[PDB]
Amino acid sequence: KADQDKMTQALVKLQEEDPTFHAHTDEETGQVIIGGMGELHLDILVDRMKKEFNVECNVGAPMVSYRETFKSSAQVQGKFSRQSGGRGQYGDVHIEFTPNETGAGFEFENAIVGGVVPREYIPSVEAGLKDAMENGVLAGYPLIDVKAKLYDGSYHDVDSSEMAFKIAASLALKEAAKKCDPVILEPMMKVTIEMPEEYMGDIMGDVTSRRGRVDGMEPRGNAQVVNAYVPLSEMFGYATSLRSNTQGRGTYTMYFDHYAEVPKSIAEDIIKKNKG
RNA sequence: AAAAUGG
RNA sequence: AAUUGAAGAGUUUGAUCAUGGCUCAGAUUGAACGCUGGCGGCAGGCCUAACACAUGCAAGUCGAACGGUAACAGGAAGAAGCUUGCUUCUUUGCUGACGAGUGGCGGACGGGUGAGUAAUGUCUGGGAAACUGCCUGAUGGAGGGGGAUAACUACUGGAAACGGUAGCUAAUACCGCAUAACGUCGCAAGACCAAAGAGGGCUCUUGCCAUCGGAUGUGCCCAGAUGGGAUUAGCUAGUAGGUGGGGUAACGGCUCACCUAGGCGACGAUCCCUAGCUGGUCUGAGAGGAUGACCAGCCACACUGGAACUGAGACACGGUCCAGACUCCUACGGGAGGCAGCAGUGGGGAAUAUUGCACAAUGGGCGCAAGCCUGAUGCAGCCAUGCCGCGUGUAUGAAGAAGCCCUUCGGGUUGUAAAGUACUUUCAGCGGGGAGGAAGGGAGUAAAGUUAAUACCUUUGCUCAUUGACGUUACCCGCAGAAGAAGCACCGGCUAACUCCGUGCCAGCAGCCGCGGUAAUACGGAGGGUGCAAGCGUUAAUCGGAAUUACUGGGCGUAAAGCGCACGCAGGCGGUUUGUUAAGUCAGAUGUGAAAUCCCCGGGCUCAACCUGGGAACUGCAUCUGAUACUGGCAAGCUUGAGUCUCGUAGAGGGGGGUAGAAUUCCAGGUGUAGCGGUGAAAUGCGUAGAGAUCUGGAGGAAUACCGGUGGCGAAGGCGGCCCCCUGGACGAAGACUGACGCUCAGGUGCGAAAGCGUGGGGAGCAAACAGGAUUAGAUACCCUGGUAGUCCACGCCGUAAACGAUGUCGACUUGGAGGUUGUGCGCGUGGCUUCCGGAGCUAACGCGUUAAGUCGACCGCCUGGGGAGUACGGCCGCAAGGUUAAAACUCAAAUGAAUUGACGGGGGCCCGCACAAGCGGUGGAGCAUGUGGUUUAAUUCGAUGCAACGCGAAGAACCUU
RNA sequence: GAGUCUGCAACUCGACUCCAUGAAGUCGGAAUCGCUAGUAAUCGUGGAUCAGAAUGCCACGGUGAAUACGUUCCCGGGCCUUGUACACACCGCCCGUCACACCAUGGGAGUGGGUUGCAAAAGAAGUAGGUAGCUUAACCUUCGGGAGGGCGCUUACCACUUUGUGAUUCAUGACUGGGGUGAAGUCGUAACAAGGUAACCGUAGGGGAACCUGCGGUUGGAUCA
RNA sequence: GCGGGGUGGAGCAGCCUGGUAGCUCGUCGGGCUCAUAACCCGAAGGUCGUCGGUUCAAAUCCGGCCCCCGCAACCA
RNA sequence: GCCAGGAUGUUGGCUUAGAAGCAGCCAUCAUUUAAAGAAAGCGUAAUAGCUCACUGGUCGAGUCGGCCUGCGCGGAAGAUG
RNA sequence: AAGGUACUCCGGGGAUAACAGGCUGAUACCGCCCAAGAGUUCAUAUCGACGGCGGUGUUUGGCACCUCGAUGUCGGCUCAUCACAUCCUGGGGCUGAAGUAGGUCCCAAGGGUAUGGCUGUUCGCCAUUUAAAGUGGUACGCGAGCUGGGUUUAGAACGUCGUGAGACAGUUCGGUCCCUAUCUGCCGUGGGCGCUGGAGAACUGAGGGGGGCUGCUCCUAGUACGAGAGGACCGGAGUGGACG
Ligand SMILES: [K+]
Ligand SMILES: [K+]
Ligand SMILES: [K+]
Ligand SMILES: [K+]
Ligand SMILES: [K+]
Ligand SMILES: [K+]
Ligand SMILES: [K+]
Ligand SMILES: [K+]
Ligand SMILES: [K+]
Ligand SMILES: [K+]
Ligand SMILES: [K+]
Ligand SMILES: [K+]
Ligand SMILES: [K+]
Ligand SMILES: [K+]
Ligand SMILES: [K+]
Ligand SMILES: [K+]
Ligand SMILES: [K+]
Ligand SMILES: [K+]
Ligand SMILES: [K+]
Ligand SMILES: [K+]
Ligand SMILES: [K+]
Ligand SMILES: [K+]
Ligand SMILES: [K+]
Ligand SMILES: [K+]
Ligand SMILES: [K+]
Ligand SMILES: [K+]
Ligand SMILES: [K+]
Ligand SMILES: [K+]
Ligand SMILES: [K+]
Ligand SMILES: [K+]
Ligand SMILES: [K+]
Ligand SMILES: [K+]
Ligand SMILES: [K+]
Ligand SMILES: [K+]
Ligand SMILES: [Mg+2]
Ligand SMILES: [Mg+2]
Ligand SMILES: [Mg+2]
Ligand SMILES: [Mg+2]
Ligand SMILES: [Mg+2]
Ligand SMILES: [Mg+2]
Ligand SMILES: [Mg+2]
Ligand SMILES: [Mg+2]
Ligand SMILES: [Mg+2]
Ligand SMILES: [Mg+2]
Ligand SMILES: [Mg+2]
Ligand SMILES: [Mg+2]
Ligand SMILES: [Mg+2]
Ligand SMILES: [Mg+2]
Ligand SMILES: [Mg+2]
Ligand SMILES: [Mg+2]
Ligand SMILES: [Mg+2]
Ligand SMILES: [Mg+2]
Ligand SMILES: [Mg+2]
Ligand SMILES: [Mg+2]
Ligand SMILES: [Mg+2]
Ligand SMILES: [Mg+2]
Ligand SMILES: [Mg+2]
Ligand SMILES: [Mg+2]
Ligand SMILES: [Mg+2]
Ligand SMILES: [Mg+2]
Ligand SMILES: [Mg+2]
Ligand SMILES: [Mg+2]
Ligand SMILES: [Mg+2]
Ligand SMILES: [Mg+2]
Ligand SMILES: [Mg+2]
Ligand SMILES: [Mg+2]
Ligand SMILES: [Mg+2]
Ligand SMILES: [Mg+2]
Ligand SMILES: [Mg+2]
Ligand SMILES: [Mg+2]
Ligand SMILES: [Mg+2]
Ligand SMILES: [Mg+2]
Ligand SMILES: [Mg+2]
Ligand SMILES: [Mg+2]
Ligand SMILES: [Mg+2]
Ligand SMILES: [Mg+2]
Ligand SMILES: [Mg+2]
Ligand SMILES: [Mg+2]
Ligand SMILES: [Mg+2]
Ligand SMILES: [Mg+2]
Ligand SMILES: [Mg+2]
Ligand SMILES: [Mg+2]
Ligand SMILES: [Mg+2]
Ligand SMILES: [Mg+2]
Ligand SMILES: [Mg+2]
Ligand SMILES: [Mg+2]
Ligand SMILES: [Mg+2]
Ligand SMILES: [Mg+2]
Ligand SMILES: [Mg+2]
Ligand SMILES: [Mg+2]
Ligand SMILES: [Mg+2]
Ligand SMILES: [Mg+2]
Ligand SMILES: [Mg+2]
Ligand SMILES: [Mg+2]
Ligand SMILES: [Mg+2]
Ligand SMILES: [Mg+2]
Ligand SMILES: [Mg+2]
Ligand SMILES: [Mg+2]
Ligand SMILES: [Mg+2]
Ligand SMILES: [Mg+2]
Ligand SMILES: [Mg+2]
Ligand SMILES: [Mg+2]
Ligand SMILES: [Mg+2]
Ligand SMILES: [Mg+2]
């Protein structure tokens, strides 16, 4: 970490030395990601750090930011009552959690009937859910693609507090996760690979090996272009492979697409990792 | 006799 | 004439007064940053890395010291193509000159930096033991010789740097000899010591040597002053002194030997941390506080550590030697170098300039002079960095235009603002004139002086050409045309300056108080305004406001602050009288206190900034001459303060020993019979193994009813039956005696409740701990039944309490009243002590009030917002418990005192109500009506919700109503 | 089951009648309400609303009690006084442990630096002293030498450097102590009223915590009719 | 290997000796209070680990199967 | 053994990014024939391509694979020789 | 009518345990058969479910045959010797083998095959090497060769159990290792006789023993191969480690 501060300075200098060098700390992962136009390029930079900058470093695969979503729908109740004398803290909310349309995120519905939960406490309930959803409901990753319907609740004239209702809301989400079976999501990436038709088969074979799907192929100029969607984690190291397959005559451009459920095996591994 | 508390 | 000088505000509360912190308005800067940007003058400009430095430059000069001649520019001579009379080519230091060398002088100045340094520094004032190139005064001398040596030559070693060997040579280079005295040595007699020539035409000029002066510079000494820390109190063996010897220009432990045992320090030594000092600068009414950039003086340092050499002067920025780290060269053997001179580069940093020009002037080195050298200096460049002056137009202009903003849509505001019209043109721009900084120096020419000389030289006049980096100088003049020239911050209060719109505890703002949750003068934008202006804001920084460290000029009953009390050393302070001294003090004088700056009066730049003449001031210090009241010293006194003695009085004053009565407990026995004991109510407990109760005898410990008291005694803490023994203090009466013998007191020392600790005793009662029983949601409590340490004694330790009057001690003074207690004189006096109340005065108020918290004086202790914290760490003390001394970071905008109006109280008093009591009839249970909640529903419309919603809005939903 | 009436229309969803049927209920847990006389209690009657639709509301008469000793207690209100740390005013204020996060700081086996004391070692260059040897322009000379000097060597002083052992200062250290700041956490309620056991001071013992208990002290406690 | 357990939500009875589910707390409804706690009144909730066997009948007895404890697990 | 042919509606359809005999899933055909699978393989992203089955020619006598049984073979690595 | 004895003692047993041997082979280890699958496709490059068949003697065991008128037992040291189920070096097939480097299987036993830290350790983990740090058998090779740390006498203590004496597949500190080699074997070294008359030399070679390891650099050649990164075979030369 003494060389970490030096690493910052080293990366700054390296960026000045080479425009193609791009240093960027991924906020979600909290890991600095070094971008290069080639493996050898990055290698030389790292070697330079070790010597010129005198910064000992070890390269690694960028961590992937995953998300969670309830795979099942279940109505749940969250009750929080803490009254032992004087001003207490009562709050009960019955919230129905249902898998939302992928990408629709959170679609909270206030279906409170009979004004069981007073209007003033309603926003707190929702806000409390949102905060709890941001926290991991399965492994620790932000819960997305879920719909919470507060159909029923309970309140006390004195004990009930907005914060109590936020607590009750969070409690509901917890028990919902136990019944709604959240699943980990992985960020899919749309990759556009262009190469001579001679290597087309090999490229598509690589994508399938990664786990990605070939969207389709299309003729451009002289080099065929294959559209595909590959997981970010799997996409790592594609550059070298592409050049190897195409004899350094292949180019690819990857962009984020959506979040797909991590393979049950992979999901299990992620949960294990997050657990410890 | 007992007789706490009240973001 | 040298003065003219002094503002507050916001924020603790429901409100108030006080206390107290925080914040703000001002001024200032080597500034930085952001935004903006016409011009000029003057000035300033690496605060950081005493970090590392590429390149050039910053110290040379002299041929009137000398051998020479490397050049070159000539001359003469001789050869030459032979301009047939010049040219060429050679020779000749031959001359003008001059490379290199010897020599002399300078290089110790000038320029840079502030690392080190808390005094071998600086500043002020004194002093004896010195030295001093160049300059200047006076008096003498200046004779006659010698031996070298560079350059040079040959040779030779090295990559280079740098050399080696042999030969030759000069001097104002070097050494004898003579000379030797207002010199040195010595008591004296005696003895001893120097020199250089050069230049012009015998003379003049310059230089040389000896001595004594002058000036100047420099060295040295002493006293006072010059940061912080005691959570640094001891320090020191050349150490302190002496003596002798040596050493220095000189005094000196400067050095050495020997001898003695000193020296320094609470008036701060030693050690630690920080730091160049000063004249000055900034702030301040001042006193202070802060600071030491530029300018001037002084000191210190020059890659780091160290040393000497030369010299008048250095332990030497651009010298030497050694070591070290760096950089560079190398043939690997060895070499070379030092920007804290100027400019400049890299690095560091928020941030600080051009590898300019000229020696025209001033000043310096060398020279006879001419001249040469000078990054000193004079100037130019960049930079709004500051200061100062000026400009960006000026009059007219209602059309009160458009257009913007706002509006009650009437209008208002921008705003005479703009258009429009009439003028002016600073400055910029273009053109053309034009100072002054310039003195001198160089030619002649003249007279005089000098001399043998109308020579040469010197002096003063005279005459003729001639010297400006800045520079396109200032300044003046002319020409075209308002043309080419305004921005920045702010408008909730403080604080001068308000609306609209957008946003909606979000975004945001903010020095403080706070502002923002849908009518934001507080955010953001717009319109309008306010303040400043080529600047305006922000940040950092200092002082002020802050009387908030209070010398001037504050506090301590309750706000922070009186040591628990006392004794007492050092220290501070001290009644009254005479004489004496003159230390302080006061007066006058004299020397000094650099210049600059500041101040006053002036002068000069068109003004101002800026520059300059004179004065004032420098508040201080030394010395001399005076004054003598007060303070001090000395001497003699006096009695009034203080003290002693004679006599008597009161007292729970202390220490020791003895004794009495009451009660509790226990033990033994008698009588007697079922309870006792305890509580709010109980229970545990005790009792038929005879309790409790009652009576008798005995044992032991502790404390002394009543008297008894706003009583008494004691420094305080404390002290209570009676008796004796030992002992301290206080007070009164009337005399005598002493003669200021006093007061306070850092440090120090002693005393010091209760609890606690050590050792050895004692132990009735009481009772931390502990146990059980209750109480309670729980009850580690309060209550009950038991019960150990301890409480008691001896000796030792601890050293603290709301150790309180939350009020230090001593002295004097300033209306009264009612009491207590204890003397004393003759009902009326007069002392000591004490309680309550109260006047003036004082106090924020409460209160204090002759026992002051009034009015003053002496000395001491202590305080400087609330927390953190009387804590940590260190020291000291302790057996331990702990005590004592005593921080910081961090955090908050308060904390606090007294009093006021409420409210409230399981505070008090006085009243009252179907409040309770005394009664009567009900509700809660059933069925049903009705309202409500909830749940259900396509919808079950909406509102009402503790008392004070729920047969409520609804005094009447089949449709309508709805 | 059979009707009546009002009304466009009585299924949802009217009142009423007739016949039949004949539920719970045998006096109401804890708790709780009204009423002091023409009152309660009970008995009928009328009215508004309104087509129709009262056990409600509003109003009218009939009959018609019991009990009040009193202020000990409960609750509320008024007035006077007193304490107060309360002021959207006791539904006030407010203390500490514990949980979590963050910040500064103390201790800590130690670890790495700076500075420095003491005791030694060391000895470049230079300067001074001595002189194994070597060498020598100027002076002297008996002409051989001599005087004197230089070099070398040696000694003293001393920089770099080295070693041991302390002191001090700074940084860092598993873990740990207390402090502060958070946020509607948990546990109680210690203080402020006599705060419900007056509080507080010193000391000692005990206890999850605020604290409790003993001993002595202070008033900076209320109360007193 | 030898023993003891597995019963309303929690901790405990009942088993021995078949018929014949208790106690305290918690929970729920009503009350008290401004409200909460405390307090008062009323009520619900184990078919007895998991099956099999026996018996007219099984928490009870027998035997597995799982669970959770205790003890033993040695000497060359 | 060898020389040939080895197909046509038709890439059967669906699905498949693509899937044409040869990913998978449904089919499962018909046609010209001597005969030629809605394909037994290799192959391709899919294609294509290379076979094969099937069949015709050539060749001129046996040929092919099960059953029962005799005897052998592999499976079969160790420490003094 | 219960216990302790490690303070112990006597008579007996290999009728009966602990050690080593034996028998056995459950277990262990090694190999094979079938092939569901995995491997983009594709059982068999590599791997392999559900099941099946063997081999070794190799762990943990079973049995109690040898030894109780005694067969010393963990680990280390010294010294070895064999097997091959091969760790390195040699040869080869396949590969999901571009090269380099691997994977897997076959052949091969000539030689070679760490030092330290910690622990009694074997082992293991760790540090740093190496071409490699092989796996087993040999009374878990080797105490009439050494050690004596472990373990199992008598002393003592802790935890624990027990009323206690004492005890523990707990721990802790301390605590006597004898033997002059007759025979076999082995390393050396002589005497006798023989080999056909005696004697002095020089030999032939049946037979036996020893030895046999390997790194790195350079060249080939930055050549083949690879888009690059990298980087050879084959062949040649030099210089080391260990050992003799
Ligand atoms: K104030
Ligand atoms: K300095
Ligand atoms: K000295
Ligand atoms: K002396
Ligand atoms: K000053
Ligand atoms: K120095
Ligand atoms: K000189
Ligand atoms: K000049
Ligand atoms: K004062
Ligand atoms: K004194
Ligand atoms: K006097
Ligand atoms: K006792
Ligand atoms: K005092
Ligand atoms: K503070
Ligand atoms: K009822
Ligand atoms: K109806
Ligand atoms: K009606
Ligand atoms: K009151
Ligand atoms: K800490
Ligand atoms: K430390
Ligand atoms: K209390
Ligand atoms: K106490
Ligand atoms: K026995
Ligand atoms: K096999
Ligand atoms: K395959
Ligand atoms: K045996
Ligand atoms: K192979
Ligand atoms: K081998
Ligand atoms: K072996
Ligand atoms: K054995
Ligand atoms: K052994
Ligand atoms: K043996
Ligand atoms: K032996
Ligand atoms: K034998
Ligand atoms: Mg010259
Ligand atoms: Mg001379
Ligand atoms: Mg002489
Ligand atoms: Mg300094
Ligand atoms: Mg002032
Ligand atoms: Mg000298
Ligand atoms: Mg110099
Ligand atoms: Mg220099
Ligand atoms: Mg410079
Ligand atoms: Mg920088
Ligand atoms: Mg020059
Ligand atoms: Mg205003
Ligand atoms: Mg608004
Ligand atoms: Mg300021
Ligand atoms: Mg002040
Ligand atoms: Mg004050
Ligand atoms: Mg106070
Ligand atoms: Mg106070
Ligand atoms: Mg006092
Ligand atoms: Mg005193
Ligand atoms: Mg005087
Ligand atoms: Mg002056
Ligand atoms: Mg006097
Ligand atoms: Mg007496
Ligand atoms: Mg008294
Ligand atoms: Mg005591
Ligand atoms: Mg005692
Ligand atoms: Mg008692
Ligand atoms: Mg008691
Ligand atoms: Mg005190
Ligand atoms: Mg007292
Ligand atoms: Mg006090
Ligand atoms: Mg009074
Ligand atoms: Mg303390
Ligand atoms: Mg202390
Ligand atoms: Mg009812
Ligand atoms: Mg009503
Ligand atoms: Mg309707
Ligand atoms: Mg009244
Ligand atoms: Mg620390
Ligand atoms: Mg030396
Ligand atoms: Mg309390
Ligand atoms: Mg109390
Ligand atoms: Mg109190
Ligand atoms: Mg207690
Ligand atoms: Mg066979
Ligand atoms: Mg064999
Ligand atoms: Mg034993
Ligand atoms: Mg025996
Ligand atoms: Mg046997
Ligand atoms: Mg036998
Ligand atoms: Mg055996
Ligand atoms: Mg045997
Ligand atoms: Mg298997
Ligand atoms: Mg066996
Ligand atoms: Mg047998
Ligand atoms: Mg035998
Ligand atoms: Mg093999
Ligand atoms: Mg072998
Ligand atoms: Mg072999
Ligand atoms: Mg061989
Ligand atoms: Mg090892
Ligand atoms: Mg063995
Ligand atoms: Mg072995
Ligand atoms: Mg032996
Ligand atoms: Mg043996
Ligand atoms: Mg042993
Ligand atoms: Mg052989
Ligand atoms: Mg061999
Ligand atoms: Mg060898």
**How far, in Å, is the centroid of ligand 16 from the Cα of A88?**
50
Give the closest residue to A192 by CA, choosing from A241, A251, A238, A246. A251
- Residues near strand B (C-beta below 7 A) are A 85-87, 158, 161
Q: How far is the CA of A53 from the centre of ligand 44 (A)?
A: 19
CA of A213 to C1' of C754 (A): 92
Domain A67-186+258-276 has CATH 3.30.230.10: yes
Contact A159, A83 (CB under 8 A): yes
A205 touches strand F (CB under 7 A): yes
Resolution of this PDB entry, in A?
A: 2.2
Distance in Å, residue A100 CA to nucleotide G141 C1': 77
Write down the experimental method used for this entry: cryo-EM
Q: Where are the domains of chain A?
A: 1-66, 67-186+258-276, 187-257
How would you write chain A as a 3-class SS string? CHHHHHHHHHHHHHHHHCCCCEEEECCCCCCEEEECCCHHHHHHHHHHHHHCCCCCCCCCCCCCCCEEEECCCEEEEEEEEECCCCCCEEEEEEEEEEECCCCCCECCEECCCCCCCCHHHHHHHHHHHHHHHHCECCCCCEECCEEEEEEEEECCCCCCCHHHHHHHHHHHHHHHHHHHCEEEEEEEEEEEEEECHHHHHHHHHHHHHHCCEEEEEEEECCEEEEEEEEEHHHHCCHHHHHHHHCCCCCEEEEEEEEEEECCHHHHHHHHHHHHC
Dihedral angle sign, alpha carbons of residues A45, A47, A49, A51: negative
Tell me if A1-66 shares its fold with A187-257. Answer: yes
Nucleotide nearest to A215 (CA to C1'): F17
The CATH number of domain A1-66 is 3.30.70.870 = yes
Q: How far is the CA of A96 from the centre of ligand 42 (A)?
A: 87
Assigned CATH for A187-257: 3.30.70.240
CB atoms within 10 A of CB A275: 8
